[PDB]
């Protein structure tokens, strides 16, 4: 269990149940002690969050012809924050807020984390991403980080294999239930979570 201790954890529109900053600091420390490292944030819907935290991240019927298929995450919680919410309305018409997740991989996989300046989603980068990872896309036991789009913030795409080997836990960064769609407010990020959120240094040259 990597959730530290303190009573069952759940995801609510109300806030994440039983997940203080303090518990976060304990669970992080313990993940490092077992040789895991933090690589980014992942925002998504409550139902989804629960699944990932209790059951882990798992691909499921991907489009095999989809060369950028993977698990997207982001170093900057703000960028992740944007996906932290229902993507479609419930029957009544409500679009509730989501949750922010902290993604960790076995430190033993860093050798496969690369970076580029080109912008991911298009073909011009494909060749260069492939150049950096040593084999044609999609990514597999490797990950690429680069600008979400020209001048945008950076996103990270863990290939499905690697993704399935992550360990995800709650963030102490809450989504706002009364401002769904707003941008993450920098002062709502715990100073202590900020301390344990540096990213590893990714390679820019192939191996």
């Amino acid at each position: 269990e990597f959730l530290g201790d303190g009573g069952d954890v759940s995801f609510s529109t109300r806030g994440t149940q039983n997940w203080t900053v303090e518990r976060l600091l304990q669970a992080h420390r313990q993940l490092e002690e077992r040789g895991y490292v933090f690589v980014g944030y992942h925002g998504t819907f409550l139902e989804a969050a629960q699944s990932i935290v209790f059951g882990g991240v798992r691909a499921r019927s991907q489009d095999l012809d989809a060369i950028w298929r993977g698990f997207y995450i982001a170093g900057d919680p703000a960028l992740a924050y944007g996906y932290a919410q229902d993507q479609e309305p419930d029957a009544r018409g409500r679009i509730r807020n989501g949750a922010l997740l902290r993604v960790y991989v076995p430190r033993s996989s860093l050798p496969g984390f690369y970076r580029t300046s080109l912008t991911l989603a298009a073909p011009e980068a494909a060749g260069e991403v492939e150049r950096l990872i040593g084999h044609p896309l999609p990514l597999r036991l490797d990950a690429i980080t680069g600008p979400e789009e020209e001048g945008g913030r950076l996103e990270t795409i863990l290939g499905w294999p690697l993704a399935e080997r992550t360990v995800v836990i709650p963030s102490a960064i809450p989504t706002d239930p009364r401002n769904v769609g707003g941008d993450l407010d920098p002062s709502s990020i715990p100073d202590k979570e900020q301390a344990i959120s540096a990213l590893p240094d990714y390679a820019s040259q192939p191996g």
């Binding site: 529109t13 409500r94 401002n179 769609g181």
Partner: protein, 823 residues
């Protein structure tokens, strides 16, 4: 006994032989016990739809001789008594008046030891105000003997004093027109007894007995059985002085022929003197039946007394011989019950309890049935006759013969008899009877008038309101029973028209009611019946409203997450008139946009242009908030209309000041830019945008909050009226008018009481007016506070901050910037 629909209908045709009454009594005075006894005695049963017991049918027969003693037109020896249910506590003001308004007679229960208690005294006044004839019963006599071991003469003096108190009230508050309505034991309008043991009697009962043993026409036998009348055992003569020629005392007739017999049976039996009991019993011709013979102590007395003086009959005797039929009373009660011309074609039809005239049916209350979550109307036919299928005009509270507001010309699906818990279909029902209707639930909230005359006014309306102004959050103490709460809440709302249960965005379960008590009750019934599961209830809270005072400082703008769609809008105030118009069905969401436009344009000064572009109302798609489409040439615009509306429904249900509902907020969509492809303009994208732009607009349009305010009507003796103004001045109350009832010393103060200041109001008014005051308060209007909700120290800000904290939100209110584009 059991009756067929025919028997009942037949019985309902002889209105001269019907009795509509209630039982005025404090619960701790055997109110429920006595009532039962009548049911267990004359309760009418019919020879799969259940309802909430509102009235009980009673049958009673009398001798052609008895029928003559009735100083009011009658016909036949059969009688139909409608026992209409009453509340337990007086606080239920509004519904107490409800039952009274449909009754003609009243069985007032007073206590032997305690006499007439304050509460019963108050209801009595009210009953008198509706011109209800009272009939008294001094209950709990046993407690006098067994406990106090009072003498025959002391107990006499007691009843004397008690009857005296009652009449002090009856004479002081009844109408001079009605004539002397005081109760007189000698005239058979006062019974004495004990609900516990199940016995009671009237002077008229012992007078029919000792009737011949003295060679008298009971007229003079009962006349002697009370007051100062004596029978010297020795001279064997009747005198009018408490002493014989020598100066020795003489026992009163009452003490001699009534109290003595009873007093001995008590002394005999409770002392277990088995030698006397049998002898004593045979003398009164009381035959124990086998098993009862071995009984002793209370067990015995209890059975002897029941065979001796059957409590049920004593009461049924006064009901028939003294309470007015729906014919005698409507003649002098009509004018008071019709809010139209005292000579109007209908008002007349009311006086004459005319079954041929245009319908005049009064709906006193809606009662919950098993058949779905539907409600059957309960009331009385004051004129004409109501029949299944008959199409009727359902005139609601706000109706006025002039306009067409609050009218619903529909057809009466089914007419049924309110046989307590069960209903029995009946073709028609002539004036003078209490009946039930099926199929009005969606036209009448609670009270109303049904007619046929197009020129018929409503009958004395009872102000009620469905405005949730007080609510609480319900939580289960033990998470396991959660589903059991989710059911009861659904059950609760189903039992009451005016209770509300819903879920906030926060996912909390809310229970909102008409007031402090109304909610209180609802919460009890939930943790005890509907859910029966232990719950965590939050403290009572007043429902506020969020509104704007002007147009948005500047245009409000928000863009979807795609950053591909934008919504430009401005918010501006709606005029209270319009809001009221919306709240009052005038401006209607379901109307023809054109017709409705014409209305707003004409009667309310709106640009027929704007009004024809209303996209939706809100919340719940019908509130006093609107979204006007003022865009110009925005391609695909209609393809995001459902989203926008949807967004609006949430924006208006929980505003940005502190989660409260919006009121009178006009949202004008000035512009919109959308992505060419629909994939990127879905609900997930527009809904949040709109919702956020609206918030932005609102926060820019000078935010303010409204508080709800009650209109309290109070009945109170000139003497205690002091306590009223006393308490009103410590609650920010505002006196609207004070009047006096011509004859009596009964003032009736009306004032405005802020709902957030009404907590524990009745309790405080109690102490203040020595308990003589009788409150009736309803929701009246929304008041816009002047102070700035944004300034924590201001008065409104104080409300806001607290509320926000309560809801565990960020202490400060969001600036418009947070919702505007982060540009």
């Amino acid at each position: 006994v059991a009756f067929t629909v025919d028997q009942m209908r037949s019985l309902m045709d002889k209105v001269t032989n019907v009795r509509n009454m209630s039982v005025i009594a404090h619960v701790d005075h055997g109110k429920s016990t006595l009532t039962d006894s009548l049911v267990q005695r004359a309760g009418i049963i019919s020879a799969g739809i259940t309802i909430k017991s509102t009235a009980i049918s009673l049958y009673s027969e009398m001798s052609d001789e008895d029928v003559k003693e009735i100083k009011q037109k009658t016909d036949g020896n059969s009688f139909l008594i409608n026992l209409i249910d009453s509340p337990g506590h007086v606080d239920f003001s509004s519904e107490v008046t409800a039952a009274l308004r449909v009754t003609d007679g009243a069985l007032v229960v007073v206590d032997t030891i305690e006499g007439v208690c304050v509460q019963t005294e108050t209801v009595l006044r009210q009953a008198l105000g509706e011109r209800i004839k009272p009939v008294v019963v001094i209950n709990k006599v046993d407690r006098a003997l067994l406990e106090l071991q009072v003498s025959k003469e002391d107990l006499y003096q007691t009843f004397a004093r008690t009857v005296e108190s009652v009449n002090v009230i009856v004479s002081t508050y009844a109408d001079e027109v009605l004539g002397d309505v005081q109760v007189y034991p000698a005239r058979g309008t006062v019974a004495f007894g004990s609900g516990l043991h199940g016995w009671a009697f009237t002077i008229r009962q012992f007078a029919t007995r000792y009737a011949k043993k003295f060679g008298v026409d009971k007229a003079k036998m009962m006349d002697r059985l009370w007051g100062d009348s004596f029978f010297n055992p020795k001279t064997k003569k009747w005198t009018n002085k408490d002493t014989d020629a020598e100066g020795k005392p003489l026992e009163r007739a009452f003490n001699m022929f009534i109290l003595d017999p009873i007093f001995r049976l008590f002394t005999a039996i409770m002392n277990f003197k088995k030698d006397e009991i049998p002898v004593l019993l045979e003398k009164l011709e009381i035959v124990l039946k086998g098993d009862e013979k071995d009984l002793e102590g209370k067990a015995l007395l209890k059975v002897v007394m029941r065979k001796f003086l059957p409590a049920a009959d004593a009461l049924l005797e006064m009901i028939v011989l003294h309470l007015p039929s729906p014919v005698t009373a409507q003649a002098y009660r009509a004018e008071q019950l019709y809010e139209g011309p005292a000579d109007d074609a209908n008002c007349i039809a009311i006086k004459n309890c005319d079954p041929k005239a245009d319908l005049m049916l009064y709906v006193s209350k809606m009662v919950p049935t098993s058949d779905k979550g539907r409600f059957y109307a309960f009331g009385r036919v004051f004129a004409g006759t109501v029949k299944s299928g008959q199409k009727v005009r359902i005139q609601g509270p706000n109706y006025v013969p002039g306009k067409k507001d609050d009218l619903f010309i529909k057809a009466i699906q089914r007419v049924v008899l309110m046989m307590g818990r069960f209903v029995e279909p009946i073709d028609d029902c002539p004036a003078g009877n209490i009946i039930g209707l099926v199929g009005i639930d969606q036209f009448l909230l609670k009270t109303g008038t049904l007619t046929t005359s197009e020129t018929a006014h409503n009958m004395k309306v009872m102000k009620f309101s469905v405005s949730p102004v007080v609510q609480v959050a319900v939580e289960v103490k033990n998470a396991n029973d959660l589903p059991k709460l989710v059911e009861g809440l659904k059950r609760l709302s189903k039992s009451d028209p005016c209770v509300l249960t819903y879920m906030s965005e926060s996912g909390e379960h809310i229970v909102a009611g008409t007031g402090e008590l109304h909610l209180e009750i609802c919460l009890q019934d939930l943790e005890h019946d509907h859910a029966g599961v232990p719950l965590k209830i939050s403290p009572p809270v007043v429902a506020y409203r969020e509104t704007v005072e002007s147009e948005s400082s500047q245009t409000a703008l928000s863009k979807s997450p795609n950053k591909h769609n934008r919504i430009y809008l401005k918010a501006e105030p709606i005029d209270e008139e319009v809001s009221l118009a919306i709240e009052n069905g005038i401006i209607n969401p379901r109307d023809d946009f054109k017709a409705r436009a014409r209305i707003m344009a004409d009667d309310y000064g709106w640009d027929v242009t704007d009004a024809r572009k209303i996209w939706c109302f809100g919340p719940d798609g019908n509130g006093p908030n609107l979204v006007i489409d003022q865009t110009k040439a925005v391609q695909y615009l209609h393809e995001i209309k459902d989203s926008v509306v949807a967004a609006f429904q949430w924006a208006t249900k929980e505003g940005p000041i502190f989660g409260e509902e919006m009121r009178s907020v006009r949202v004008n969509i000035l512009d919109v830019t959308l992505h060419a492809d629909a994939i990127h303009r879905g609900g997930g994208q527009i809904i949040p945008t709109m919702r956020r732009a609206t918030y932005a607009g609102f926060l820019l349009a000078d935010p303010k909050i409204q508080e709800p305010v009650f209109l309290v009507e109070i009945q109170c003796p000139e003497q205690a009226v002091g306590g009223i103004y006393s308490v009103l001045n410590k609650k920010r109350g505002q006196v609207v008018s004070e009047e006096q009832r011509p004859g009596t010393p009964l003032f009736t103060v009306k004032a405005y009481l802020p709902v957030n200041e009404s907590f524990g109001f009745t309790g405080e008014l109690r102490q203040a007016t020595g308990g003589q005051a009788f409150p009736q308060m309803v929701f009246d209007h929304w008041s816009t506070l002047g102070s700035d909700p944004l300034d924590p120290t201001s008065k409104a800000g104080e409300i806001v901050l607290a509320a926000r904290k309560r809801h565990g939100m960020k202490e400060e209110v969001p600036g418009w910037q947070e919702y505007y584009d982060k540009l």
